[PDB]
Structure formats: structure tokens, C-alpha cells
From a paper:
To disclose the molecular basis of 3C1-mediated neutralization of SARS-CoV-2, we determined four cryo-EM structures of SARS-CoV-2 S trimer in complex with the 3C1 Fab at distinct conformational states, including S-3C1-F1 (with one Fab), S-3C1-F2 (with two Fabs), and S-3C1-F3a/S-3C1-F3b (with three Fabs). Among these structures, S-3C1-F3b was better resolved to 4.3 Å resolution, and the other three were at 5.6–7.5 Å resolution range. Furthermore, in the S-3C1-F3a map, there are two RBDs in the up configuration (RBD-1 and RBD-2) and each binds a 3C1 Fab, while the remaining RBD-3 in the down conformation can still bind a 3C1 Fab. Besides, our S-3C1-F3a structure revealed that to accommodate the third 3C1 Fab, RBD-3 in the down configuration exhibits a considerable upward tilt of 22.1°. Surprisingly, although also bound to the side of RBD, 3C1 Fab can adopt a distinct orientation with 32.2° rotation when bound to the down RBD-3 (orientation 2) in S-3C1-F3a state, compared with that bound to the up RBD-3 (orientation 1) in S-3C1-F3b state, leading to slightly varied epitopes. These data also suggest the adaptability of 3C1 in coordinating the binding to RBD. Further structural analysis suggested that in orientation 1, only CDRH2 of 3C1 and CDRL2 of 2H2 share overlapping epitopes (residues 498–505 of RBM) and clash in nearby sites; while in orientation 2, there is no clash between 3C1 and 2H2 Fabs, allowing simultaneous binding of RBD by 2H2 and 3C1. Therefore, both 2H2 and 3C1 may simultaneously bind to RBD through adapting feasible orientation of 3C1 or coordinated conformational changes, avoiding potential spatial conflicts. However, here for both Fabs, we observed a state (S-2H2-F3a or S-3C1-F3a) with RBD-3 in the down conformation, but can still associate with a Fab. This suggests that for the antibody targeting RBD domain, if only the epitope is exposed and there is enough space to accommodate the Fab, the RBD can be “grasped” by the Fab regardless it is in the up or down conformation.
Spike (S) protein protrudes from the surface of the spherical virions and mediates virus entry into host cells. It consists of an ectodomain comprised of the S1 receptor-binding subunit and the S2 membrane fusion subunit, a transmembrane domain, and a short intracellular tail. The CTD directly engages the cellular receptor, human angiotensin-converting enzyme 2 (ACE2), and functions as the receptor-binding domain (RBD). Moreover, we captured an ensemble of cryo-EM structures of SARS-CoV-2 S trimer in complex with the Fab of 2H2 or 3C1 up to 3.8 Å resolution, revealing the MAb-triggered stepwise allosteric rearrangements of the S trimer to coordinate the binding of neutralizing antibodies targeting the SARS-CoV-2 RBD, also providing structural basis for MAbs 2H2 and 3C1 as noncompeting antibody cocktail.
Residue numbers in the entry:
A (entry chain K): 14 to 69, 77 to 247, 255 to 620, 641 to 676
B (entry chain H): 1 to 213
C (entry chain E): 2 to 222
D (entry chain D): 438 to 485
Write the structure that this text describes.
């Protein structure tokens, strides 16, 4: 339960190469004398795997993931590796798939196991008359809520701790396909010391149990043998690899056994075998794949610098509306400049709820409403959500999910007119609380206490509708203030006002993603000498394809060329002759990808010789390749 | 309603370090960020309004910025008088309630707690009363849990908890918990154990006494 | 701008509550002045708001049991609560919410404590405590005394008339439904007891009752 | 089974899952009692 081992010696993290291993049957379909291809979670060839041992100086049991493919190839000498541990989090919170082996049966239980930091098995009492008997069981602590149990056939496992070179090889592939856990097994005798044989081995399915759990991490159950923290293991080594959904070509004999497999996505010589569907490829040039340049960045040079919003009729208008019967205006399809007001340092209160005004230049919205009225000096704090006053309780209440702006500035020299300004009214009393975006034009007498007013004024009875009034000889709290209340929202319409940083440029000589006014895709811009008309924004060729655009800010004409693409050809020799490669990337130079440029494309792998010979393998433009000394 | 999810509710910094209190809002707030400072034994005070300008009278060591949903208060060179509970206030709707609170503490050395158990005196047993109070003082920090054991069972009803703040002499804490019982409720029990759990070791302090003496 | 809270120490139930918050430096003519109470245990509660018109709205928990008035000539505002009970026992505070000169001003006062309960003036009962002989051995010996059933808070709780300071820890009262309790202890080393005189000194000036329970092995000669 | 599975005070030993982030696969079961995403809006850990 809490027993840990301290007999682990530090080793450098080396790796092991896999030449032609990691091929199993994708299904239960009998195929004979055919060359068919399949695509499933197989091991890619010429890859590097991890380095773990299960011996008496290295004893490792890490926590490795499961979703990135699991390839378990291990050599066994003294029967140390017994089973495997699967599960989501490997604790009591989620389910776990536990496979144990007590040298009599392969016990598979699906319960809520609680594992420790290093599960193992105990083979102890090796002083005298040992006979390799099991002593302890330290896999898990407890289990509850079991759902499945599988008992295999009984057998006799030799628990003798033999040393020396390995004589057995066991390969396993674990995966989960919609809850059905499939286990592949293959056993073949080998003769090596440390590494794995660089040959071929086809794995066969053994069991298929409908577990139905999610597996994200997995471990490996090991044993201990020595002739509670000082015990050592026997002689074993396991290498864990990752599977990738690649294309593999399988060869079937008359008996249906897979004899050879070639990974298609490894080298261009292997791409010819999967295209022609033949393991024996003669001398010639064949199509292998298709080349495509991957873009790096993605800029959107869609909007221009014109079409500014006329904010002079909203902030500096001649007359606003009332605070209880206001008229909401819609302003869209323009560019609202809000940075010249925050940096002016002349506003009394410049705040914006939802999005800060420093972030409004880099934030997109659908539209923006307007709500302009004239308030007093003490009513600046009243136009705010979650507040009170003569406006927030009687005239206009802001909602909790407010995404607009509260803009305030001193307008003592603006609202001062000859004879006074009495064109604005406000409510002073109300019978109940307010609602968000609610108007009120009633003139009913408010009743404060239990005494009725009977429609006339008196004790705690006043008229709700009052008029504004200000004097220049008053204090700060009685000055008129012009305020503009905004309202941002998101609709099904696209964004019309965001603010494109008041400046736009154009990047050329690079295949990247672009989003223009009449073309969206990947391309690389080059210099040109064309002259566009002042109303045109983009140009097309005779093929009705946009290949020339215009900068919306700079008066320059730059044509856009799309990124290079085309088929990939190779020059392949005979199967029993050589395995050299010469990749030919068509419709591209030798810079965007034995270097020689042709009219068909860049050829990498062939040395340019000035001497002329007979054309063996044709390429194009009078250039051919051959195999000479 | 927008609830300010406080990332830290209890921080232990020293004099001269930087205090980082992050209140991640569930929705977009913008200028709807308010910082209050409530000293122990004093009144609260608005410190940072709208995440742009500090209050008049606040020195230049208190500042803050942020946009969107990520807001972090920046307190550089925190002195000894800055030990207070910081709240993140929202202006969504009424009532004007406060959040959880982030209390700062001067980082000192930890100490083992001492739990004392007092049996009832002869004056309460003659009249018919009983009193079992478990004191706990001279410990650090204040995140020390005290569990009641009445004959092996935990009792929470009738327990009067009383916690104290950080002392100004040696930066220690103290707490106490009493239980009002009678003469018939005192002799019916036989086991009574008050323990304390600290972060220095997994072994708690064992303290108990026999009811029948 | 500096505020100041004031009020009585104890308030009898089924009466009219009275509070006074004076605003110095600026007369109350523009802005908003609130009343925020705080329960003992770091829990604040907002009751209601008062507008410039005079009509006030409150929380649904206190519909017609709270009245807020103001006066522009005395530069202060009052708070009145009708039909008080044990739920109104909190630490009240006053604040100022107004704008001006492109700044957000929010000034607070000191604070006042008003304790309302159904219990009347009850004299305290001091019981000195002593550790028994059937306890677990320890290097530290603690002395203490428990006082329960008194009203109101706060009181003067010390040890040896303030001359004792070795391990003296004074705990505040616990908010119950009717009355309050006390808690105090003194931690001394094992070489100090019983060479030093330890006396439980708990005073109650509201009812003119002062009981000093010295630790004496009763009865003596 | 009203007279078979009931008891005094009610039988609260049977539970069921009401909401989930995605639909269940054919022949799939889960005994987890943790809080997951209910519908189009996730709870993000605790219920909220």
C-alpha cells in the first residue's frame, strides 16, 4: 500500500529505433494473395521510442498517456512482466482496468482500484529452499463497485529468476475503440541482450472484452526477484512506443499471413510502393504525393481608414432629450474614434462597463447605441448600475449586464443660454423601483406613507415631474453636465466598428494567409508595374482569378501570387538493385521546400553533370537521370 | 450577477515584496472593478476605482491595471500597516454586498500549538452546572483546525467559537471554544479529547482527561 | 472629509433606534450617504438607500422597519429602526458617495456598536477553573475562568489588575440570541505555578458588579 | 414494485444522471458521480 523501492539507478534517457515493427491485423478479414492497404493506429517506421528497464540496476514504472497510441514490445527471460494497469486517473474517483497475473491465471477485473506510486508483486523468502513462491501482493489497496471479471485458463508459470541473454519476445498493442478494449499478442523466440531486433513481426488479436471505460493514462505491472525497500527485480526490459494513424500496405500470402508491410508516410521511395500497390517497383518515374506550402501567419487587410462616425451630433449637439422619454439612436457602418477623448484628459468621468476604453480599440462589436441627456452636477454618479439617486431610482436604471460607456464632461459653458435653459424635465418621485430600459411618463401623486394623498399635495405628498435649473454662481454640484450613454451588443450581423489601429500595411514576399476584399486564401505578394483606377480595389486575370490587389492606405500596386503546389515525383531504382532517392518537387524552386533547378521543378538528389549520356529516366526539359559510378 | 472568483484568500508575504491579488470575473466587467481595504478594528476604505485611478490620499505604492476579465492588484513595498482584508466589489445591482476577502499576513516562523482542557470546578458541580472549555494559543499561522470529541463523536451544536486576529507583540494567534452543559449531561460522558492539526507534522497534539478522575 | 459615528451602548427592545453620523468638511447637499452594518465575524450587510428627493427604498428583509432621515442645515443624517430585535445587533458604519473635481471620493468614519437583544441587564457569574489531576502531562500549565450570562458588551477582562502579562489572552464575546459570554486564559510555564499569584479579574461596570475570583483551594483555614 | 423496493422514510439509495455533455455511445455505461457539463453552458467544476 505504501511500500516504495529505492533501488533505482540513474540512467541517461536513450532511445531505440524500430525498423519494421508495429504491424498488426486491423480486423478479422481473411485476405489471401492480395495487396490491400489500410489506415489505423500503427507504429511509424524509423521512429524513436522510450528507454525503460525492469532489471535488478534500472527499475522504472512511469505514468505514460494512452490517447497518443500504445505499442508495448518487451523481451522476457524470467517472467517478470505479469500484466498491465489501465484507467482514467488511476484512483478511486474513476474506473480502472486492471490486468494482474499471479502465475496461475490472467485475472482481469474492472473495479474502482486505488493504486500506489509504484505497484509491484512480491516473490520473497529466498534464503534456503526457495522454490520461487509468491509472498506478497502490492498492486492496489482496495476495490469497490466492480462491473466486469474475466478468468483465463489455468497454467504453470516458471518463476525461476534466470539470468543472461533474452530468449523470448512478446509484443502487445493496446487500444480502445468505443469501449471495446482489444488486446493484440505475438510471441516469437529471439536472441539479443539489450536492444530489440530490427525485423518484422505481425501481431494477432487475443481477447476483446467490452469494458466501456475511458482510459487516458496507463502503467506496467512488474515483479521483484532477489536471491521492504531493498528488494530488486529479475531480468526484463520493455519499450513503449506511440501509434499514429498512418497508411500501411499489407502483403498477404496463400495462407493469409502478413509477410511484409511498408509505411507510406516515411520516405518518397515508400510512397511509390503504396501508389502502384506493388512491393516490387521497377526503374522509372512515378507520381508519389502532392506538395503544398504551409502558411505561417494570417492577417486580414479588409477595412480601410475612411468612413468615420459623425460623433459631433451626439456629444456636441445643440439640444438633447429628456431623461425619462429619451430617444435611442443607432450608429453603425462606420469607424468610431474613441482614443482622442480618453487621451484629452478633459472629461469628468470617462468609463466604460464590460470592455475598458483602453481595450475598445482592439474589440469588435455589432453596433453601438446612443443615449444623450443633460444632468446636474450631483447626477454624474447616478447614471451607473447598482447605484441610487434622482435618476437611478425614478428616471433610468442601468442593468447588471451593461456593456456600454458612461462619458461625462463639464458643460457649464455649453448649456448656458440667454434667459435660461428649461427644455429638460426629470422625475423626482416614483411609487416603486425601476426596470432596465424602462420609461415613465406618468404624473401620478406619490404616496410615501400610509396617509393617502387623494390626488393633491400635502403631508409626504409631492409632484413627481420637476424642471431643471442652474446658475453660474452655484457650486460644482449644480452645474449642467452633458453625458452620452452608449450600449454595445452582439447580433447575427458581422462586426462593423472595431477600430483597425488607424493604420494598415502590407507584407509581401511570403506565402501567408490573406483576407482581401475579393480574395480569401494563401498567397505571396510580389512587385509589379500596373496602374489601377481610383475606384477599383482588386484585379483579376483572364482565368477569372484574383491575382492583383491594392493597398487601402498606401498608393501602391502589388500583385498577389498564390502559393506553389503540385505533384511530387521520385526516381526509383530496382528493388534488388538499390534504394537511393531523388525527390522532384514540381511547380516550385529549390528555396520554398545535389541541387539543380529545372523547368518542371526542383530536383533534390541528383548531381548536375556536364557530360551528356543516354536518357534513362525522363524528367523534362531535356534533363534525364541515370545510375552511374 | 457577476461573482469575483478570488484566486487567493490567504497570502503570506514579507515587508518589501509584491502582493498579487487576482479577481477573475465570470463576465466582461471593464471598469466594474473596485478594491476596498478593511483594516481589523477599523472601517473599510475605497482604494482602487475603475482600475485606472487611485483614491485621493492613497500613496503611490498602491496601483493596479488590467482589462477584460483578468485584473491583478499591484501592491509594491507592503508595510506592516497594510495587513487588511481586500474585497472585490461589483456594481451590478443592489444590495451592496462584499465578497470573500483576501487577508495578508507577515511571514513568520511556525510554532506547535498548545491545547489546554479545563474540567468543571466544585462550584458548578454543587449547584448543578458544568463547563468544558478547550483553549488554543501560541500557534502560527491561523489556519489551525480544532476538533471536538464527545465519546468519540464530533459535536458542533452549542460550541461557542471565538477567534482572534494577529497580535502586535510577537505575531501570534489565539482561539477558544466553550460548551455549556449541566450536571446530568456531564457525568453521562466518559471521553473528551481536544486536538489541533498543524502544517508542520502529520501527528496532532493529543490531550484528554478522564471524566471520573 | 471625515465622518464620525455615535450612538448608545445598549438599546432596549421594542423601542426606536437612534444613530447619528456627522459629516465634517462638507455639508450634505450633493451626493449619497449610506448606512452599512457589519455583524461580528467579518460579515457586512446592506440595508437600503436614501435619495435626494427623500423617498427611500430598502431590502425586502427590512420593508418598513427602517427609516433614514437627513438634514441639510445640521450637516448630518440619522438612522431609525422600528420594532428592533436580536437580528439588528451589528456594527454600523457611515460613508459618503459623491463626485467632484474629476475624482471618486469615498470617505468613511470610525464606527459604532449597538447591541439589541431580548434580555435585560444581567449580572455576570464568574467561575474560576483549575486543571485536574487525571489529565495528560505537559510542560505548560494553563489557568483560566469562564464567565457566562452577562449583558451588555464590552467589559473589562484582565488578570491580576493588569499587572500580569505572561501568556494573557483576552477573547471577545460570542454573539448568542439573548446574552453574551466571555473567555480568558493565561499560559505560564511549569516552574511558575503556583509560585505566582493568579487571579481571575472580570469587571462589569454597567450593572456595578465586580467579582474577583482568586484561585484558592477552598476551603482554607 | 411499490411494495417491494420502498421502506420507512423512503429509499434514497437509487440515483440517476439527468444531464451530460455528450450523448452516450451504443453499449456504454458510466458509474461516475462527479459534476460534469449539463448542457450548452458548462458548470466548470462546481455547480454554477
Amino acid at each position: 500500500q505504501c511500500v516504495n523501492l529505492t533501488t533505482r539507478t540513474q540512467l541517461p534517457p536513450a532511445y531505440t529505433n524500430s525498423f519494421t515493427r508495429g504491424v498488426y491485423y486491423p480486423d478479422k478479414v481473411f485476405r489471401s494473395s492480395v495487396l490491400h492497404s489500410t489506415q489505423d493506429l500503427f507504429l511509424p517506421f524509423f521512429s524513436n521510442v522510450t528507454w525503460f528497464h525492469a532489471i535488478h540496476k534500472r527499475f522504472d514504472n512511469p505514468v505514460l498517456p494512452f490517447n497518443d497510441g500504445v505499442y508495448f514490445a518487451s523481451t522476457e527471460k524470467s517472467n517478470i512482466i505479469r500484466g498491465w494497469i489501465f484507467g482514467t486517473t488511476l484512483d478511486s474517483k474513476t474506473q480502472s482496468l486492471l490486468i494482474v497475473n499471479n502465475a496461475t491465471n490472467v485475472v482481469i477485473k474492472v473495479c474502482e482500484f486505488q493504486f500506489c506510486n509504484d505497484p509491484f508483486l512480491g516473490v520473497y523468502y529466498h534464503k534456503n529452499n526457495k522454490s520461487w513462491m509468491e509472498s506478497e501482493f502490492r498492486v492496489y489497496s482496495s476495490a469497490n463497485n466492480c462491473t466486469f471479471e474475466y478468468v483465463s485458463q489455468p497454467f504453470l508459470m516458471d518463476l525461476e529468476g534466470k539470468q543472461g541473454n533474452f530468449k523470448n519476445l512478446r509484443e502487445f498493442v493496446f487500444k480502445n475503440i468505443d469501449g471495446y478494449f482489444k488486446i493484440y499478442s505475438k510471441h516469437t523466440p529471439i536472441n539479443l541482450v539489450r536492444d530489440l531486433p530490427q525485423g518484422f513481426s505481425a501481431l494477432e488479436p487475443l481477447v476483446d472484452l467490452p469494458i466501456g471505460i475511458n482510459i487516458t493514462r496507463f502503467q506496467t505491472l512488474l515483479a521483484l526477484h532477489r536471491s521492504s525497500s531493498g528488494w530488486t527485480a529479475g531480468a526484463a526490459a520493455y519499450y513503449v512506443g506511440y501509434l499514429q494513424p498512418r497508411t500501411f500496405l499489407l502483403k498477404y500470402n496463400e495462407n493469409g499471413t502478413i509477410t511484409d508491410a511498408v509505411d507510406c508516410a516515411l520516405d518518397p521511395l515508400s510512397e511509390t510502393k503504396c501508389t502502384l500497390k506493388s512491393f516490387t517497383v521497377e526503374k522509372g518515374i512515378y507520381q508519389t504525393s502532392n506538395f503544398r506550402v504551409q502558411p505561417t501567419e494570417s492577417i486580414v487587410r479588409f477595412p480601410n481608414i475612411t468612413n468615420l462616425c459623425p460623433f459631433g451630433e451626439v456629444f456636441n449637439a445643440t439640444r438633447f432629450a429628456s431623461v425619462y422619454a429619451w430617444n435611442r439612436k443607432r450608429i453603425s457602418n462606420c469607424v468610431a474614434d474613441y482614443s482622442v477623448l480618453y487621451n484629452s484628459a478633459s472629461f469628468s468621468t470617462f468609463k466604460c462597463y464590460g470592455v475598458s476604453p483602453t481595450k475598445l480599440n482592439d474589440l469588435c462589436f455589432t453596433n453601438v447605441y446612443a443615449d444623450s441627456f443633460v444632468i446636474r452636477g450631483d447626477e454624474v454618479r447616478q447614471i451607473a448600475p447598482g447605484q441610487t439617486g434622482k435618476i437611478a431610482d425614478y428616471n433610468y436604471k442601468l442593468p447588471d449586464d451593461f456593456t456600454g460607456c458612461v462619458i461625462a464632461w463639464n458643460s457649464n459653458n455649453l448649456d448656458s443660454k440667454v434667459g435660461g435653459n428649461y427644455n429638460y424635465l426629470y422625475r423626482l418621485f416614483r411609487k416603486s423601483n425601476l426596470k432596465p430600459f424602462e420609461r415613465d411618463i406618468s404624473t401620478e401623486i406619490y404616496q410615501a406613507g400610509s396617509t393617502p394623498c387623494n390626488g393633491v399635495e400635502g403631508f409626504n405628498c409631492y409632484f413627481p415631474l420637476q424642471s431643471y435649473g442652474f446658475q453660474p454662481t452655484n457650486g460644482v454640484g449644480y452645474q449642467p453636465y452633458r453625458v452620452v450613454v452608449l450600449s454595445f451588443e452582439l447580433l447575427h450581423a458581422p462586426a462593423t466598428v472595431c477600430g483597425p489601429k488607424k493604420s494598415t500595411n502590407l507584407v509581401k514576399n511570403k506565402c501567408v494567409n490573406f483576407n482581401f476584399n475579393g480574395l480569401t486564401g494563401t498567397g505571396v505578394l510580389t512587385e509589379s508595374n500596373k496602374k489601377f483606377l481610383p475606384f477599383q480595389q482588386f484585379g483579376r486575370d483572364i482565368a477569372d482569378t484574383t491575382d492583383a490587389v491594392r493597398d487601402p492606405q498606401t498608393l501602391e500596386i502589388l500583385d498577389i501570387t498564390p502559393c506553389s503546389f503540385g505533384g511530387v515525383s521520385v526516381i526509383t531504382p530496382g528493388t534488388n538493385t538499390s534504394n537511393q532517392v531523388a525527390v522532384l518537387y514540381q511547380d516550385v524552386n529549390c528555396t520554398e521546400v545535389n541541387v539543380f533547378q529545372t523547368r518542371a521543378g526542383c530536383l533534390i538528389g541528383a548531381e548536375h553533370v556536364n557530360n551528356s549520356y543516354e536518357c534513362d529516366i525522363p524528367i523534362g526539359a531535356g534533363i534525364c537521370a541515370s545510375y552511374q559510378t | 450577477d457577476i461573482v469575483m472568483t478570488q484566486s487567493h484568500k490567504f497570502m503570506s508575504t514579507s515587508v518589501g515584496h509584491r502582493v498579487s491579488i487576482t479577481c477573475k470575473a465570470s463576465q466582461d466587467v471593464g471598469n466594474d472593478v473596485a478594491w476596498y481595504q478593511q483594516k481589523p478594528g477599523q472601517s473599510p476604505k475605497l482604494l482602487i476605482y475603475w482600475a485606472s485611478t487611485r483614491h485621493t490620499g492613497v500613496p503611490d505604492r498602491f496601483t493596479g491595471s488590467g482589462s477584460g476579465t483578468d485584473f491583478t492588484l499591484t501592491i509594491s513595498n507592503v508595510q506592516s500597516e497594510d495587513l487588511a482584508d481586500y474585497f472585490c466589489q461589483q456594481y451590478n445591482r443592489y444590495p451592496y454586498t462584499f465578497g470573500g476577502g483576501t487577508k495578508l499576513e507577515i511571514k513568520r516562523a511556525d510554532a506547535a500549538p498548545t491545547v489546554s482542557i479545563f474540567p468543571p470546578s466544585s462550584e458548578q458541580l454543587t449547584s448543578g452546572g458544568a463547563s468544558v472549555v478547550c483553549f488554543l494559543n501560541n500557534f502560527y499561522p491561523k489556519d489551525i483546525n480544532v476538533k471536538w470529541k464527545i465519546d468519540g463523536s464530533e459535536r458542533q451544536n452549542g460550541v461557542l467559537n471565538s477567534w482572534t486576529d494577529q497580535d502586535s507583540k510577537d505575531s501570534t494567534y489565539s482561539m477558544s471554544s466553550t460548551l455549556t452543559l449541566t450536571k446530568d449531561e456531564y457525568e453521562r460522558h466518559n471521553s473528551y479529547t481536544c486536538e489541533a492539526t498543524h502544517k508542520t507534522s502529520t501527528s496532532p497534539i493529543v490531550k484528554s482527561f478522564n471524566r471520573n478522575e | 472629509v471625515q465622518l464620525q459615528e455615535s450612538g448608545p451602548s445598549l438599546v432596549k427592545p421594542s423601542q426606536t433606534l437612534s444613530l447619528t453620523c456627522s459629516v465634517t468638511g462638507d455639508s450634505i447637499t450633493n451626493g449619497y450617504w449610506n448606512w452599512i452594518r457589519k455583524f461580528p465575524g467579518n460579515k457586512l450587510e446592506y440595508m437600503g438607500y436614501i435619495s435626494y428627493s427623500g423617498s427611500t427604498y430598502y431590502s425586502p428583509s427590512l420593508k418598513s422597519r427602517i427609516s433614514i432621515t437627513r438634514d441639510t442645515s445640521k450637516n448630518q443624517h440619522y438612522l431609525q429602526l422600528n420594532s428592533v430585535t436580536s437580528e439588528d445587533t451589528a456594527t454600523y458604519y457611515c460613508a459618503s458617495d459623491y463626485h467632484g473635481s474629476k475624482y471618486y471620493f469615498d470617505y468613511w468614519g470610525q464606527g459604532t456598536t449597538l447591541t439589541v437583544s431580548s434580555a435585560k441587564t444581567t449580572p455576570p457569574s464568574v467561575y474560576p477553573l483549575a486543571p485536574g489531576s487525571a489529565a495528560q502531562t505537559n510542560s505548560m500549565v494553563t489557568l483560566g475562568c469562564l464567565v457566562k450570562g452577562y449583558f451588555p458588551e464590552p467589559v473589562t477582562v484582565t488578570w491580576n489588575s493588569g499587572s500580569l502579562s505572561s501568556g494573557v489572552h483576552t477573547f471577545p464575546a460570542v454573539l448568542q440570541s439573548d446574552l453574551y459570554t466571555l473567555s480568558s486564559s493565561v499560559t505560564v510555564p511549569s516552574s511558575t505555578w503556583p509560585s505566582e499569584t493568579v487571579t481571575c479579574n472580570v469587571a462589569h461596570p454597567a450593572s456595578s458588579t465586580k467579582v474577583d475570583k482568586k484561585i484558592v483551594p477552598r476551603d482554607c483555614g
